[PDB]
Design a protein around this ligand. Sequence first.
Ligand SMILES: O=C(O)c1ccnc(-c2ccnc(NCc3cccnc3)n2)c1
Ligand SMILES: [Cl-]
Ligand SMILES: [Cl-]
Ligand SMILES: [Cl-]
Ligand SMILES: [Fe+2]
Ligand SMILES: [Zn+2]
Length: 344
Amino acid sequence: PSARIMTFYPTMEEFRNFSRYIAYIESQGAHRAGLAKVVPPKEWKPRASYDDIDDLVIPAPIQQLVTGQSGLFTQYNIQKKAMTVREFRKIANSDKYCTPRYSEFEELERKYWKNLTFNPPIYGADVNGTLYEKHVDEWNIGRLRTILDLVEKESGITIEGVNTPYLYFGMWKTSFAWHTEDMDLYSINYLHFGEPKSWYSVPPEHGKRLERLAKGFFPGSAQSCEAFLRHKMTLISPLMLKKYGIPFDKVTQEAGEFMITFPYGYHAGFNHGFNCAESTNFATRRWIEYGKQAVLCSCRKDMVKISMDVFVRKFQPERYKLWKAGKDNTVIDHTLPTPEAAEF
Ligand SMILES: O=C(O)c1ccnc(-c2ccnc(NCc3cccnc3)n2)c1
Ligand SMILES: [Cl-]
Ligand SMILES: [Cl-]
Ligand SMILES: [Cl-]
Ligand SMILES: [Fe+2]
Ligand SMILES: [Zn+2]
């Protein structure tokens, strides 16, 4: 009930200061759902036109093969040859891959879960780049100016799609599997244009229960890596979440809207048709404890690992020594707002 997804409508004055707005929506309890929508002021636009991007290269499109049954699936990625947005769009909008006919979201959703394993779509994922113009200073995914920037500006370490922006070109039925962000960071997702993106969310206070459930259904995977959900290959239908008593909410994001995900907010979803979304990670002071406690995948090589030392040193100086001795036993309360939210 207080873990349901909220939508916010900032004025241009509220929108101006990013980290301040995030702190505001946490004061209203937005973080409890693990996901929140923000509809920007009708005046604001990140780009003048999306006609001049047909020559943009998607270097590594992915075909999404999905195997499973009874609401439990595993997704396998087959990388395909580079293509342009124009060539992707043509395939997306072709008769073979286009959105089927439907009336209500519920019908499209039933079609997603019924046809998930058929006709594998192509996802134009993880494209380095921004579609914002340089002048745009509000909610600019390339330069949000949050404390996550301390990873670059204390070690020159750049982590693609984490402290830099990614673009995602979707088509009908392309999916994102159940996961939290690397290091349990926040994320920001802006749908530039096109057909909607629908999302499922589990409240961070029920995150562990989702993990216990997924371990039960994939014991082999859980055995090879405790954090296997971080492989971003596990899909689980809402019918199964409901059957096993996991609380979740759903929301559809339309072009021109932001979705924010919160630390330890498990999320998943799918694209309704051809679209383009930009995203990256960010942090607030509240995140630091999640970062310190995040359960990481070590079974693969290049996995995103951020050193927490700089954060603990700067923002928790009184706990640094204990933390470094491995004796910090701080317990996270998923209901508390970020320190920054006391203003509101
Ligand atoms: O397809 C989408 O629209 C979507 C939505 C939400 N999350 C993701 C997503 C997919 C994969 N990883 C992460 N988060 C961690 C991460 C790690 C490295 C680079 N970028 C992100 N998020 C993708
Ligand atoms: Cl309560
Ligand atoms: Cl077309
Ligand atoms: Cl560390
Ligand atoms: Fe994500
Ligand atoms: Zn792993």
